Symmetry: C3
Subunit: 212 residues, 3 copies
């Protein structure tokens, strides 16, 4: 078979290209190539994809499409009685590092499983023990700090915890924490930290994120 | 290739429709339409998509599907023997604004690239300079604040930073920050803020999010 | 039509190249067994490859694959530069409602077992101590966790509020709510509120990032 090919030099929207293909061929399910720059395309860069429908009625078209771009981004969309919905772009991720680096291990570098330049955002996870126990537990779970990668020398994960069981004599206590990290190529470094108690705090996971 | 059509009126689950279809037709790769409200459908709204199996053996079915909603929501799923996995529903996003609005620019309105009513969640990104430098630098990177859009007049991005290098006698210092933002149609406003140094802090990105 | 097994001792990328070279097919479906070097995912998958031409020494193409657990990966090759595979996340809303921070020791149901997720987003909805420019609302704030087996997932933060005057700076407050999960349930375990206004947990979304 012959997938639908849509060029900018055709001077035809994506939507009219799909209509014309279905008029000409009667196909309801088929693949397609759309050159980057085609008006109404699921995306800006070139893409390929799959159009799915069951009735080739181009006056009231009902169908969906699933397209992938040159950077791997996934875009899905629909047409409902010949009205085209806004294409939906998915995010993606890759787990780059997991382990347990004490906040006290400043100036230490570890590897990422891919280069940080393949990501626009990142999630850095930290795992804490609060100054005091609250209902017998000082553990916090593992907390996400999400950043946009803006070229900073330091990505700063800084926050606070309340902990302790209130008595009439002693309210809960408050504490501040920080860990700063940096990225370079396929590596990351724990640059700085501040801890307000004697317990060990860790960086435990780094996840690369794309939101194309 | 015959399409599978599944209506609520059929009193048949999505999974049984699939089984029945492959038993009736012998076809192991086909497209489908599943009316909104069908039991065990990949999503609650109406969808269309592709089922792909290894063989027409419905007693040990091995296969995948992609289903896309009337609003372009994307779901993938699988079958292993008589065990259907839960549907994996994808999120989507759109960048609505990027720039660099100072926290001190309260009352100022800027444009979004899409109407906020098209999103259920939103990420607001802020970019800071802490009061003191830490290991040679006061930048924080660009920090995400994610909200569910609940109709509030103000979405509040408020946190703390630790900054400065500890000496033998002087600890790091702490600061608080706040920026509050609002959304209306295809616009946003920087409503209020609190900064505790003379350095400039910015709102830099707004990303609309759907988690259908 | 393309089947790749760990026993073939070839990478996903070389298997695609071989398939195109052998058959001249540029669009085809595939099965890749869990463990194949360079596969879009670590578990077994099935999907669709689409390429521009059969020039395998400068391949331009894309793929969409689905794993045995339903995970979805998409990717591309541009002039035989294979770009990092783009793994989608997934989610399920597990609970929505309005549970006061003061309702400690209370349990509610989730729509699915927490063991089916690796991450969770817990949403909290606040009223700050003071009104700021006429309003003490915060919106509904996400706290995302990796589910590490902790007995408490601690949502804790601060708010500045109040209108600055000559006399009276803005005020600061700390808050905390701790939650736990067991099977298809969650419990509001502990809290700290520094005013008399009602604070809520409002949403719990289960998240997978395979
Ligand atoms: Na996706």
């Amino acid at each position: 078979s012959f997938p639908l090919l849509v060029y900018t030099s055709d001077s035809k929207t994506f939507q009219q290209a799909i209509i014309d293909h279905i008029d000409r061929t009667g196909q309801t399910t088929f693949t397609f190539y759309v050159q980057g720059g085609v008006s109404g395309s699921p995306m800006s860069n070139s893409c390929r994809g799959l159009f799915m429908s069951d009735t080739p009625n181009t006056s009231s078209l009902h169908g969906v499409y699933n397209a992938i771009g040159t950077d791997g981004r996934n875009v899905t969309g629909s047409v409902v009685g010949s009205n085209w919905t806004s294409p939906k772009t998915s995010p993606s991720h890759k787990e780059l590092w997991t382990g347990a680096q004490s906040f006290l291990s400043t100036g230490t570098t570890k590897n990422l499983s891919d280069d940080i330049s393949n990501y626009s955002y990142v999630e850095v996870y930290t795992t804490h023990k609060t100054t005091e126990k609250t209902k017998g537990n000082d553990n916090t779970g593992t907390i996400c700090h999400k950043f946009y990668l803006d070229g900073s020398g330091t990505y700063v994960c800084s926050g606070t915890f309340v902990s302790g069981d209130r008595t009439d004599t002693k309210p809960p206590i408050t504490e501040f924490y920080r860990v700063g990290v940096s990225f370079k190529g396929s590596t990351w470094t724990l640059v700085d930290s501040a801890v307000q108690n004697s317990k060990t705090q860790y960086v435990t996971r780094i996840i690369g994120i794309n939101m194309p």
